[PDB]
């Protein structure tokens, strides 16, 4: 593994003392080791760039380990490419080393640099050596300076004479340091957000606080801002990453076995530091009108009541299971709404209270872990539906990207019609939906991930089942995506074994769904 | 003599265990793993001494007291620890350099010896009857001691080295300060350097796995984690000088529990029970040991609180009772009796078909729920179901706040549950959070009516971690795993036992400790349980 | 051993970074600039050691605490800095001599090491895991340590040298006094001389300027603070330093180290003049006002006319006199022809206020605000005009209702700043300070200093010469983010350190105190150079 400029590199690296870790018989620098992997699809046009890497010791695991205790490095590195194709594919790739000071972009003519050619049917690996073309005498670890770059681009487009569901292949990259690599001057990503316990039975969703049991695709698309954080440490909702009792002090309560009706105007929660739209914990679902004996369907119900705002004492005769929601113009006519601007928050008991109370000013106290109201023992579709979600203005939306569809996390929740059916019951199963897992939301609200991902990429994890595996992507806005296409069937997580991170991937690349 | 460079060992003190035969045999036998790696003798990381540790020598240390002791390991040098991540075996010796920061007026001496493998290290080990070296407190130049690699195997795998020698430094004669006063301690700095025969073999992947350090991380106690009884954000630490016990939602370091609940808060639901009301107070009850639908245990339904029942009748409101919102539902079809929805109080009581009496033993007891307010209309049924929420509140007759609950006498535990008792100056503590009270459902923190605190035994993430993973070999019986909590002014130590109880060095005090000034948590590791934890607050 | 001469290095201590390969490579690569200059080995300026700095060592310093840092530069020697004015490049190492003024009864050790370039210097640096040397507190002869030139460039340009190594000295073991008592500290002196391979290249004309400035050493010279320089807000002679433990912000007439400003004024005091505004008086108090963001004639910014004070407006009416308000003498002039309304000449108060067509309310944000001037005394005759001009003087006074003096103004809550202005906050034991001068007050226009009625102090953020220098020259490469450029102020009893950041705020090591520091005993100012911003500045007063 020789280079054309080894002598000058070694001579000029002497400014930092004698070379270190330069024993040529060492095991860590005689073999190739895995570095990375990328995707090559039939949609890639000729001249498009598929892989780019800057020269650094971070391209080999053992050089990365050894760089923890050294302040400088010099020398080149050898790269190896392994293509996992078959005999029916056709196409070529080209790889070249770009000297420093040359712009890298779509208008780069890799085919006119000194290069090598990689075939889609190639069995033996193709190697290329990147020398250390540097304007400095050595590369300090903190501020390496100008370095050359390795660029991979399509030479001839990939073709599949069969045609079907196989439109992409994978290419593996392995590295090995050159003979002239050396160290001098001895010195002293959101990968952990989604770990296996989060989805194997410990983590819970951020809307119903129930154990996640499935993944529900949403081909139409949806939006969510209550208890939902992006990758910039900001939120558009009014709740904190916890489930604590909903408590408001000033509101209008009246009942004109009677149904107590409490309501208030939005934008009046001065005691909530996160936002003033609603008290912390208030659900972001629309209000379903009901009266008399009729029981509303798919409504958020919490146990609680009214309390005296003068001294904090509770009206013991108003304890019941109320339904909470957002509605507009409800001093007399209940009408659902999905916009917090110029709206009202309404709570109304679904059962007759012991005795009604008329007060101009009164407080509301409800629990945050609610249930779903249903008129009978039969189960309904997963709720809340995309048309029932209430969001603040300026909340970004999640839309399908090619064959990638945003999904929700589905858990099992109780229903009033039958409070005994949990799973496998003859009366059906009821599923609530959330946008993010609670540990993921807490992690996004605590730490900063504003530089780990660029706009237009997904951070991908791999979920491994007994039969095959699947990929799960996370965007910068905080929505999760799966490669389920236009299907809407619930995905079961019973057979999940472990979760393996993958990393940043283009958002226009279809995620693998081998189930 | 006042200047020492990075390659000077100083005075070379020799012990009889250092022989040429040992080094030659070690080098010859280490070849089973292939050619040696990282063996160049001119590398900078091998020729220099580097800082390893520091300890304190006080005038109050009796002769024989051990001041420093380490097992032979690549972890004793900063640069061998880095290189050990990519190798699967090692062999050879290591040198230890000691610098004493004393003066010419001090007296006292230290003794150092190398303990051969297979010998227990403890207070009963007499170092001075082994071959040893004596070092004076007036030493100006460094003194270097070499630990040879005495091993019955060909090499030490990084996964489990096996039998290894041990280096021990102890007090030979007491430190003497002729002037007396406030100056009564000196420091000793330890630096290490590998021997000429040290080597690595069998390169491996850096991300290859061969302690419960990650259980207690800063977010758990800075405002994210919650307690395992009231599901509220932990805000304080309450010492319990008397001692207590707890088994509901509480795991040990062996992956076992003595309670009946799972590490979560989900609605309490039971199907078969007796309900009667002889604005009326509905009374539901059932016999313990009848929860056939609960796989964890049959004592009670999952989520049922482990607090005793406080009797009450008429207008009188019970004090310090667990109250949950819910009611009765028809066990025949699962439909709920809509006229019985109210805030009930739940508890364990014995012989309550007519006379309420509290109890703290699940053996031959009953589970009782009773509404504290008048329901819309009572229901009489021989068989009925109970449905309550798991996140309860504390019942109080007025707006005033009471002491932290549940008190140690109110906790109900299954037979065979181990207890937590003070050990010297180490006292078990509980995690205190803020909970609502019925008398005033608006006071949260800083209110003029007082603050109400609920107590739990373990944080919820810690309980989940103990219930998922196995830690049955990380800690020996009689040691505490210690973390360090760093505040703005000073720091404190927190210990965890094998039974799962937390301990602090608060002595006999009982004042609540505030966690508002907490900055970060740093793990320390295993320590003897009879060593007083530092409480510099 | 008890006597040391200027050419004696004492005990020579070396580390692993001093190698033959480094010296040979440095000498070979330095040849791109031609033959070396100033290599006469018998010159006095090369053979003797000269003073660099003195620092203290206390018994309360824990191991790992950093006591002394220095960045490799020709400015570290008095004679190499002078010679650097006529050359375009340099290369080579430097020798550092340490003398410890200890005694035979003390204990404890120090540790020194050379830090390669590209490594941050701060509390997280473990000096003892580098190649290092240990020095006892009982050392009698001096100890010399050599810093080699570890550089990624062939040579260091005079303007922008590039990356250089650093020398750090920290505590190895605690200093101990066996007797105890009140004696708990000793002192260490550092001296420097160039190594045998130090050289200059490419002689240049002394009057030529380097694209990037060497360092802002000449910005803060002794005349600036001994009675000649003035502050940038009240144009008064600086007489004190006022610590601000709470923290503050300032953008009007305030420049950073990048040649940019966030205010609207120029580094001068010239008459405030605006042409279009609304004047009305509904002995009467004339009230003129205008909307912010309408100063189209001001090239620096459109927020306000050049010279307009950045203080909030204090409401007042009738006989009540506002307290701590900016008052300037002037009036209204006819915007049609430029003639002045001679009947409106009076001492007005100027400020920033929001929504004042009827209700005066103070504000501290220039976004969506208004500029308001209102006379504090009755004018000869009022004038009603829809459009009129305002002409005021820039050197104002402080309005007070009586002869008593008040606290220093403007307070941090009164300062008005544009959006995007960075703030100054305490860093460990380093607190931002303001420069305090003596200003007149309306209640008593005769009390200057030592009066029985009290002394009134105005405050500014930067001295005027410093602001002018920052606005003229470029210092965007002399300091890295996270370091302070430190000067030393020498008084009759002890000395103190003063740091300057990249944002342009000054810092002192006064901790949490807020007492004014007197500059009467100042003798001279000596530059020190770049230092970590997390290192406590010496305050031996």
Coordinates of N, CA and C in Angstrom, one line a residue, chain C residues 101-237:
Chain C
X101 N 9.5 31.5 45.0 CA 9.9 32.2 46.2 C 9.3 31.5 47.4
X102 N 9.7 30.2 47.6 CA 9.3 29.3 48.7 C 10.3 29.3 49.8
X103 N 10.0 28.4 50.7 CA 10.9 28.2 51.9 C 11.0 26.7 52.1
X104 N 11.9 26.4 53.0 CA 12.3 25.0 53.3 C 11.3 24.2 54.2
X105 N 10.2 24.9 54.7 CA 9.2 24.2 55.5 C 7.9 23.9 54.8
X106 N 7.7 24.5 53.6 CA 6.5 24.3 52.8 C 6.5 23.0 52.1
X107 N 5.3 22.5 51.7 CA 5.2 21.4 50.8 C 4.3 21.7 49.6
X108 N 4.2 20.7 48.7 CA 3.4 20.8 47.5 C 4.3 20.9 46.3
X109 N 3.6 20.6 45.1 CA 4.3 20.5 43.9 C 3.5 21.1 42.8
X110 N 4.2 21.6 41.7 CA 3.6 22.1 40.5 C 3.9 21.3 39.4
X111 N 3.1 21.4 38.3 CA 3.3 20.6 37.1 C 3.2 21.5 35.9
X112 N 4.1 21.3 34.9 CA 4.0 22.1 33.7 C 4.1 21.2 32.4
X113 N 3.4 21.6 31.4 CA 3.3 20.8 30.2 C 3.0 21.7 29.0
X114 N 3.4 21.2 27.8 CA 3.2 22.0 26.5 C 2.0 21.4 25.8
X115 N 1.0 22.2 25.5 CA -0.2 21.8 24.9 C -0.1 21.9 23.4
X116 N -0.3 20.9 22.6 CA -0.2 21.0 21.1 C -1.4 21.9 20.6
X117 N -1.2 22.5 19.4 CA -2.3 23.3 18.9 C -3.5 22.5 18.5
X118 N -4.7 23.2 18.6 CA -5.9 22.6 18.3 C -6.7 22.0 19.5
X119 N -6.2 22.2 20.7 CA -6.8 21.7 21.9 C -7.2 22.9 22.8
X120 N -8.5 22.9 23.2 CA -9.0 24.0 24.0 C -8.4 24.0 25.4
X121 N -8.2 25.2 25.9 CA -7.6 25.4 27.2 C -8.7 25.8 28.2
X122 N -8.9 25.1 29.2 CA -9.9 25.4 30.2 C -9.9 24.5 31.4
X123 N -11.0 24.6 32.2 CA -11.1 23.7 33.4 C -11.1 22.2 33.1
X124 N -11.5 21.8 31.9 CA -11.5 20.4 31.6 C -10.2 19.8 31.1
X125 N -9.2 20.6 31.1 CA -7.9 20.0 30.6 C -7.1 19.4 31.7
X126 N -6.7 18.1 31.5 CA -6.0 17.3 32.5 C -4.5 17.4 32.1
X127 N -3.8 18.3 32.8 CA -2.4 18.6 32.5 C -1.5 17.3 32.9
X128 N -1.9 16.5 33.9 CA -1.1 15.5 34.4 C -1.1 14.2 33.5
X129 N -1.9 14.2 32.4 CA -1.9 13.1 31.4 C -1.2 13.4 30.1
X130 N -0.5 14.5 30.1 CA 0.5 15.0 29.1 C 1.9 14.7 29.6
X131 N 2.9 14.7 28.6 CA 4.3 14.7 29.1 C 4.6 16.0 29.8
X132 N 5.2 15.8 31.0 CA 5.2 17.0 32.0 C 6.4 16.8 32.9
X133 N 6.7 17.9 33.6 CA 7.7 18.0 34.6 C 7.1 18.5 35.9
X134 N 7.7 18.0 37.0 CA 7.2 18.3 38.4 C 8.2 19.2 39.1
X135 N 7.8 20.3 39.7 CA 8.6 21.2 40.4 C 8.2 21.3 41.9
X136 N 9.1 21.1 42.8 CA 8.8 21.2 44.2 C 8.6 22.7 44.7
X137 N 7.9 22.8 45.8 CA 7.8 24.2 46.3 C 9.0 24.6 47.1
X138 N 10.0 23.7 47.3 CA 11.2 24.0 48.0 C 12.4 24.2 47.0
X139 N 12.1 24.4 45.7 CA 13.2 24.6 44.8 C 13.9 25.9 45.0
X140 N 15.2 25.9 45.0 CA 16.0 27.1 45.2 C 16.5 27.7 43.9
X141 N 17.1 26.9 43.0 CA 17.6 27.4 41.7 C 16.4 27.5 40.7
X142 N 16.5 28.4 39.7 CA 15.4 28.4 38.8 C 15.3 27.2 37.9
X143 N 14.2 27.0 37.3 CA 13.9 25.9 36.4 C 13.5 26.5 35.0
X144 N 14.1 26.0 34.0 CA 13.8 26.5 32.6 C 13.2 25.4 31.8
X145 N 12.1 25.8 31.1 CA 11.3 24.9 30.2 C 11.3 25.5 28.8
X146 N 11.5 24.7 27.8 CA 11.5 25.2 26.4 C 10.3 24.8 25.7
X147 N 9.6 25.8 25.1 CA 8.5 25.6 24.2 C 8.9 25.6 22.8
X148 N 8.8 24.4 22.1 CA 9.1 24.3 20.7 C 8.0 24.9 19.8
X149 N 8.4 25.2 18.6 CA 7.4 25.7 17.6 C 6.7 24.6 16.9
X150 N 5.5 24.2 17.3 CA 4.8 23.1 16.7 C 3.7 23.8 15.8
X151 N 4.0 23.9 14.5 CA 3.2 24.7 13.6 C 2.8 23.9 12.4
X152 N 1.6 24.1 11.8 CA 1.3 23.4 10.5 C 1.7 24.2 9.3
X153 N 2.3 25.4 9.5 CA 2.7 26.3 8.4 C 4.2 26.3 8.4
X154 N 4.8 26.7 7.2 CA 6.2 26.8 7.0 C 6.8 27.9 7.9
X155 N 6.0 29.0 8.0 CA 6.5 30.1 8.9 C 5.2 30.8 9.4
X156 N 5.4 31.6 10.5 CA 4.3 32.4 11.0 C 4.3 33.8 10.4
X157 N 3.3 34.2 9.7 CA 3.2 35.6 9.3 C 3.0 36.5 10.4
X158 N 3.5 37.7 10.3 CA 3.4 38.7 11.4 C 1.9 39.1 11.7
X159 N 1.1 39.2 10.7 CA -0.3 39.6 10.8 C -1.1 38.5 11.5
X160 N -1.2 37.3 10.8 CA -2.0 36.2 11.3 C -1.0 35.0 11.4
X161 N -0.4 34.8 12.6 CA 0.5 33.7 12.7 C 0.0 32.3 12.5
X162 N -1.3 32.1 12.8 CA -1.9 30.8 12.7 C -2.0 30.1 14.1
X163 N -2.0 28.7 14.0 CA -2.1 27.9 15.1 C -0.7 27.7 15.8
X164 N -0.7 27.9 17.1 CA 0.5 27.8 17.9 C 0.3 27.0 19.2
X165 N 1.3 26.4 19.7 CA 1.2 25.7 21.0 C 1.0 26.6 22.2
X166 N 0.7 26.0 23.3 CA 0.4 26.7 24.6 C 1.2 26.0 25.7
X167 N 1.6 26.8 26.7 CA 2.3 26.4 27.9 C 1.3 26.6 29.1
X168 N 1.1 25.6 29.9 CA 0.2 25.6 31.0 C 0.9 25.1 32.3
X169 N 0.7 25.8 33.4 CA 1.2 25.4 34.7 C 0.0 25.3 35.6
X170 N -0.1 24.1 36.3 CA -1.2 23.9 37.2 C -0.7 23.2 38.5
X171 N -1.6 23.0 39.4 CA -1.2 22.5 40.7 C -1.1 20.9 40.6
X172 N 0.0 20.4 41.1 CA 0.2 19.0 41.2 C -0.2 18.4 42.5
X173 N 0.3 19.1 43.6 CA -0.1 18.8 45.0 C -0.4 20.1 45.7
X174 N -1.3 20.0 46.7 CA -1.6 21.2 47.5 C -0.4 21.8 48.2
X175 N -0.3 23.1 48.2 CA 0.6 23.8 49.1 C 0.2 23.6 50.5
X176 N 1.1 23.2 51.4 CA 0.8 23.0 52.8 C 1.8 23.8 53.7
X177 N 1.2 24.4 54.7 CA 2.0 25.1 55.7 C 1.9 24.3 57.0
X178 N 2.9 23.7 57.5 CA 2.8 22.9 58.7 C 2.4 23.7 60.0
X179 N 2.8 25.0 60.1 CA 2.5 25.8 61.2 C 1.0 26.3 61.1
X180 N 0.4 26.3 59.9 CA -0.9 26.9 59.8 C -0.8 28.4 59.8
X181 N -1.7 29.1 60.5 CA -1.6 30.5 60.7 C -2.2 31.2 59.5
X182 N -1.8 32.5 59.3 CA -2.3 33.4 58.3 C -1.4 33.4 57.0
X183 N -0.3 32.7 57.0 CA 0.6 32.6 55.9 C 0.1 31.4 55.0
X184 N -0.5 31.7 53.9 CA -1.1 30.6 53.1 C -0.9 30.8 51.6
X185 N 0.1 31.6 51.2 CA 0.4 31.8 49.7 C 1.8 32.2 49.5
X186 N 2.3 31.8 48.3 CA 3.6 32.2 47.8 C 3.5 32.7 46.4
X187 N 4.6 33.1 45.8 CA 4.6 33.8 44.5 C 5.6 33.1 43.6
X188 N 5.3 33.1 42.3 CA 6.2 32.5 41.3 C 6.4 33.6 40.2
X189 N 7.6 33.7 39.7 CA 8.0 34.7 38.7 C 8.4 33.9 37.4
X190 N 7.9 34.5 36.3 CA 8.2 33.9 35.0 C 9.0 34.8 34.1
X191 N 10.1 34.3 33.5 CA 10.9 35.1 32.7 C 11.2 34.4 31.4
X192 N 11.5 35.1 30.3 CA 11.6 34.5 29.0 C 12.9 35.0 28.2
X193 N 13.3 34.2 27.3 CA 14.3 34.6 26.3 C 14.2 33.7 25.1
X194 N 14.5 34.2 23.9 CA 14.4 33.4 22.7 C 15.3 32.2 22.7
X195 N 14.9 31.1 22.1 CA 15.7 29.9 21.9 C 16.7 30.2 20.8
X196 N 17.7 29.3 20.6 CA 18.8 29.4 19.7 C 18.3 29.3 18.2
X197 N 17.1 28.8 18.0 CA 16.6 28.7 16.6 C 15.6 29.7 16.2
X198 N 15.3 30.7 17.1 CA 14.4 31.8 16.8 C 14.9 32.7 15.7
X199 N 14.1 33.1 14.7 CA 14.6 33.8 13.5 C 13.5 34.7 13.0
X200 N 13.9 35.7 12.2 CA 13.0 36.5 11.4 C 13.3 36.4 10.0
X201 N 12.3 36.7 9.1 CA 12.5 36.6 7.7 C 11.7 37.8 7.0
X202 N 12.2 38.1 5.8 CA 11.4 39.0 4.9 C 11.2 40.4 5.5
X203 N 12.3 41.2 5.7 CA 12.3 42.5 6.2 C 11.3 43.3 5.4
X204 N 10.6 44.3 6.1 CA 9.5 45.1 5.5 C 9.6 46.5 6.0
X205 N 9.0 47.4 5.3 CA 9.0 48.8 5.7 C 8.1 49.0 7.0
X206 N 8.7 49.7 8.0 CA 7.9 49.8 9.3 C 6.6 50.6 9.1
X207 N 6.4 51.4 8.1 CA 5.2 52.2 7.9 C 4.1 51.4 7.2
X208 N 4.4 50.2 6.6 CA 3.4 49.4 6.0 C 2.6 48.7 7.0
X209 N 1.3 48.4 6.6 CA 0.4 47.8 7.6 C 0.1 46.4 7.1
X210 N 0.0 45.4 8.1 CA -0.4 44.1 7.8 C -1.9 44.0 7.6
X211 N -2.4 43.3 6.5 CA -3.8 43.0 6.3 C -4.6 42.8 7.6
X212 N -4.1 41.9 8.5 CA -4.7 41.7 9.8 C -3.8 42.3 10.9
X213 N -4.4 43.0 11.8 CA -3.6 43.6 12.9 C -3.0 42.6 13.9
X214 N -1.8 42.9 14.4 CA -1.1 42.0 15.3 C -2.0 41.7 16.5
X215 N -2.3 42.8 17.2 CA -3.1 42.7 18.4 C -3.5 44.0 18.9
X216 N -4.7 44.1 19.6 CA -5.2 45.4 20.1 C -4.5 45.9 21.3
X217 N -3.1 45.9 21.3 CA -2.4 46.3 22.5 C -2.4 47.8 22.7
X218 N -2.4 48.6 21.6 CA -2.3 50.0 21.8 C -3.7 50.7 22.0
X219 N -4.8 49.9 22.0 CA -6.1 50.5 22.2 C -6.2 51.1 23.6
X220 N -5.7 50.5 24.7 CA -5.8 50.9 26.0 C -4.5 51.3 26.6
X221 N -4.1 52.5 26.4 CA -2.9 53.1 26.9 C -3.1 53.9 28.1
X222 N -2.1 54.2 28.9 CA -2.2 54.9 30.2 C -3.0 56.2 30.1
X223 N -2.7 57.1 29.1 CA -3.5 58.4 29.0 C -5.0 58.2 28.9
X224 N -5.4 57.0 28.4 CA -6.8 56.8 28.2 C -7.5 56.8 29.6
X225 N -6.9 56.2 30.6 CA -7.5 56.1 31.9 C -6.9 56.9 33.0
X226 N -5.8 57.7 32.7 CA -5.2 58.5 33.7 C -5.8 60.0 33.7
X227 N -6.7 60.3 32.9 CA -7.3 61.6 32.9 C -7.6 62.3 31.6
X228 N -7.2 61.6 30.5 CA -7.4 62.2 29.2 C -8.6 61.6 28.4
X229 N -8.7 60.3 28.5 CA -9.8 59.7 27.8 C -11.2 59.9 28.5
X230 N -12.2 59.8 27.6 CA -13.6 60.1 28.1 C -14.5 58.9 27.7
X231 N -15.6 58.8 28.4 CA -16.6 57.7 28.1 C -17.4 58.0 26.8
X232 N -18.1 57.0 26.3 CA -18.8 57.1 25.1 C -20.2 57.4 25.2
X233 N -20.7 57.8 26.4 CA -22.1 58.1 26.6 C -22.3 59.6 27.1
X234 N -21.5 60.0 28.0 CA -21.6 61.4 28.6 C -20.4 62.3 28.2
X235 N -19.4 61.8 27.5 CA -18.2 62.5 27.1 C -17.6 63.2 28.3
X236 N -17.4 62.5 29.4 CA -16.8 63.0 30.6 C -15.5 62.2 30.9
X237 N -14.6 62.8 31.6 CA -13.3 62.1 32.0 C -13.6 60.9 32.9

